Write a protein that binds this DNA or RNA. Sequence first.
RNA 1: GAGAGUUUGAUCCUGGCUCAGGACGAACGCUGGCGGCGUGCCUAAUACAUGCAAGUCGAACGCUUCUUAAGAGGAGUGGCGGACGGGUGAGUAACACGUGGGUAACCUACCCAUCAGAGGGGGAUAACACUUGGAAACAGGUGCUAAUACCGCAUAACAGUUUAUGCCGCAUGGCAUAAGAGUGAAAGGCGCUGGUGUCGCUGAUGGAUGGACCCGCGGUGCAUUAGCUAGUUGGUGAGGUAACGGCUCACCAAGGCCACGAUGCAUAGCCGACCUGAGAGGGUGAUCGGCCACACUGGGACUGAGACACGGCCCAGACUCCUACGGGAGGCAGCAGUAGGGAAUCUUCGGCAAUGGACGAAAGUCUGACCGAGCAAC
RNA 2: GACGGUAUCUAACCAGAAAGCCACGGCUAACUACGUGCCAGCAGCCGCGGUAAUACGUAGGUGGCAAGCGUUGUCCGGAUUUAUUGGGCGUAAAGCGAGCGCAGGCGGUUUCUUAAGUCUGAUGUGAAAGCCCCCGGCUCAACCGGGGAGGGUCAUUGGAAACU
Lengths: 135, 87, 81, 80, 122
Amino acid sequence: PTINQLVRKPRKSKVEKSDSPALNKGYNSFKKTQTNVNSPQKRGVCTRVGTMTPKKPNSALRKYARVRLSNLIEVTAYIPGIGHNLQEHSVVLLRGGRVKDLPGVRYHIVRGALDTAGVNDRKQSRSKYGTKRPK
Amino acid sequence: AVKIRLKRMGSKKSPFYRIVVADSRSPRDGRFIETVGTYNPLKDPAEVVLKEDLVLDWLSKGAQPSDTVRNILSKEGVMKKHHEAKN
Amino acid sequence: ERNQRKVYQGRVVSDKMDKTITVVVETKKNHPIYGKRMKYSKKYKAHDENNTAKVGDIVKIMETRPLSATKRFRLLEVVEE
Amino acid sequence: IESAIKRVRTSANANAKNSSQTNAMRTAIKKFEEAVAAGADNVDALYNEAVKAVDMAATKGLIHKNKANRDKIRLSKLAK
Amino acid sequence: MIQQESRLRVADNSGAREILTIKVLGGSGRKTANIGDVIVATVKQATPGGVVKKGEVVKAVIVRTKSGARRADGSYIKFDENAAVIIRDDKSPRGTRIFGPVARELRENNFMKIVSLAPEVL
RNA sequence: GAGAGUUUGAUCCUGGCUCAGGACGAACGCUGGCGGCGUGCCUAAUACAUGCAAGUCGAACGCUUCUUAAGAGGAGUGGCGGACGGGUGAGUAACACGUGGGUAACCUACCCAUCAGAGGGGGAUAACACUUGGAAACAGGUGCUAAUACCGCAUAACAGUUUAUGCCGCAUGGCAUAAGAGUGAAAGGCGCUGGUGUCGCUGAUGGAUGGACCCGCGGUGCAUUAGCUAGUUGGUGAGGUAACGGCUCACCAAGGCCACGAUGCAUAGCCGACCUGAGAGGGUGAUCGGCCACACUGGGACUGAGACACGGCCCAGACUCCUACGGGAGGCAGCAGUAGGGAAUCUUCGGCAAUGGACGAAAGUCUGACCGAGCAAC
RNA sequence: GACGGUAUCUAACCAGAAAGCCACGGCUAACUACGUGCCAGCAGCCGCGGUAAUACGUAGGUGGCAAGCGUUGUCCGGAUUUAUUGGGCGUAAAGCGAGCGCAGGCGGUUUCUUAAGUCUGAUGUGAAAGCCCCCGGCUCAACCGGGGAGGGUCAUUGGAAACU
Ligand SMILES: [K+]
Ligand SMILES: [K+]
Ligand SMILES: [K+]
Ligand SMILES: [Mg+2]
Ligand SMILES: [Mg+2]
Ligand SMILES: [Mg+2]
Ligand SMILES: [Mg+2]
Ligand SMILES: [Mg+2]
Ligand SMILES: [Mg+2]
Ligand SMILES: [Mg+2]
């Protein structure tokens, strides 16, 4: 471009965006608007717990939960690990991160936080999946 | 009132002070016009640094120190010189 | 001796007003990023004492107290009809 | 609440007195203006009474000295 | 002399703004009401951000009327509008603050909280 | 100013995705010894239970209670401070901020320096005593009383104004002198021996201090926002403010702003600075400091040097609280703390010993500013 | 003198009361065994798992950090991936279908002139704290303090004018 062009219209950068828009918003019941807040984790209520079939190179029953967030955005997350204490209406805590198998799951569920029971008999990579030491 | 006082610096339980020219309306640490020395008693005696010319100029222009600063300026001989210059 | 209040040189663009005119300065700042020498046609309102100045005429103006809401400047000269 | 009650009371009394004295000043001045409109020879003494009230209001914290000066100057331009 | 399909203003902050009498309570064929008489009603106009909202069916109390009230001593009260207060099953109100004046006739009918919350009680 | 992996059977380009590093007011999980230094509602400027945060002066004044006429305590009047300090950042896209300037259009209690002066009089009022108001806060009525409270009388204009000169400036104009006309001040307390010294009192100047206004330039997105304004633009008068000016009113004219982005919409406190980066730049505006704005929402004034006032007044609205149901009262975005929201971020602690501030002659009283301590591996 | 009989110093005693987190297919430092058998599950990207898995889970072992470690979320960088520094348009993304022309952008040689741009001397200011340099005190360090340096498409005045 010519410098005249670059003054008549400047370089307008490639607009960016997040891999987790649901975490980057909030809600005040008074004015009832999306409040933009950069929150690492959130709370939600599992509105469904089920299984899904992953993409073609893989084959499995991937455990998901559809969840109703504090900010009233409904979100599909993954239940990592082996086993869960979850049901519909079960309070849950959510963190970010894709699950490359299904597309519609941009989020993960956290273990050891709330009604989510810690994983059972997991001794390695233990902070992850949230289960206390075997003494 | 325009005043010549001392403002607090340094960590807790290890204080230090800067003599300073401050209005009484400003905070303990805030607006100031000029610094004219500094102070700490953390030595076995007290220990002092001063700027005689500027502090005497503000005293002439109408300053009004606090009690401890008056003691310090007495030990450094500035109040006596101001008195003499008024005589 | 006392200070000297700011003065500018410029050009007239309208004289349809009594005891007053509009004056244009035409500096040239460099665009901050790309550096090109741009135009910058700042303009002002000047108090004329006698409706002397004519359109498209070079002029000098010194600041002063607000003589109106827009006015801040005082005519000094008339240079090139 | 916190010892502001006394300032409420004193400020109301001050309001009373100050508004009274300003109204006195303004009645004197208006009286002088009407006298200058009526052309009576009492203008000479009413001028002085107006100036008197203006400066006595500059005293007692009703009137800033610049306002007093502007009033005196206006009255002077009326009389002379 | 408040009847069915008779519209009323609201004298509290419950959320409602205008009311319509569905029926009068008390007896079988009561076709009329006055101060101290409970009402069943709708809500035809509500405050926007209000608890009580459009269409709701709710009980209410008549607190002031043009066809006013009478005292033993011949002293009569009257008003320039017909207004009511929304209540629960208990005699207590839905909202918290009553507006305008109120008749004394309610103290006999035991709407004492409304009598208290009202600023002026005539 | 280091790159790596990944499209292909493989290759080179193009092009995107991800990773390698640094930093959080951080949160979650697992674990967990100590010390030092710092930081700790980023969300609901959401609502506030409780407690404490602005009082002081008896050497301004008169009462009242206890002191064998002493000192000490209660409420008075008066003065000073309450406008600082502290909190928050909602609004604000503009002289709000930053920077550089200007004010011959300005103001300034307290603090300094100087020239002067501080005379003689008057009428009240609280408090207090009775009265009604009855739960009592309130409130009203009669009477008495002091002051550095208030009033006006006496003199000065050194203040301001006009004339005459001089001088100079950047036009308006400003400085020095003289003259003219008219105006205005006050307060005493403490101590010494009428004279007094000290603190206060009144006028004028000058300085300092802080404040007010004005201008150049600069800093954010949209033109799927192109027209905008009518006291708006200017002028002659008048009024008004500490002061300039449409700041305001009348009258005269129809001008003025904008593609160099006006107007509108959205967003946002700005800055020093902080993180990153070879730099150019980007992103942020927490803690500390500066300017601004706000004090339940909106408006308005009074007092005062200073407010259109966080812990002051009036009114309207919303919201809540106590009532003996007659009527009152309140405003934590002060420090702690509660509820709620939230992914989530503190003890309902001690002291004014320090430092700073108010008041006071001084001791000293007050001070959730501040000093410290406490909790949290932040 | 609230802190506080705290800091601090002395002496007696016990190895005794005091280490975990993540990762180990490649990018990336770090490898085997067993179970499981496209299931369970892993996964920042490439992708592992279908009876012999260094990619799941456990055990052992090792590596990187360490009273912390890891993970999410946010900002920068790498990303020259909005290119002023510092990119491109024949086929990859992109030359409007083409022209006439208002505004703007740019513009032949040359004398004289100016001095808006430009260059330049001096003066002032750019608060303090902070970054950086030299010092000094906290058992060192963080931190704290002193001094200095720098910071402005900044402003006034004074020159040149080659170039626009
Ligand atoms: K803001
Ligand atoms: K407001
Ligand atoms: K494994
Ligand atoms: Mg770079
Ligand atoms: Mg408050
Ligand atoms: Mg390897
Ligand atoms: Mg794993
Ligand atoms: Mg195997
Ligand atoms: Mg193509
Ligand atoms: Mg600095």
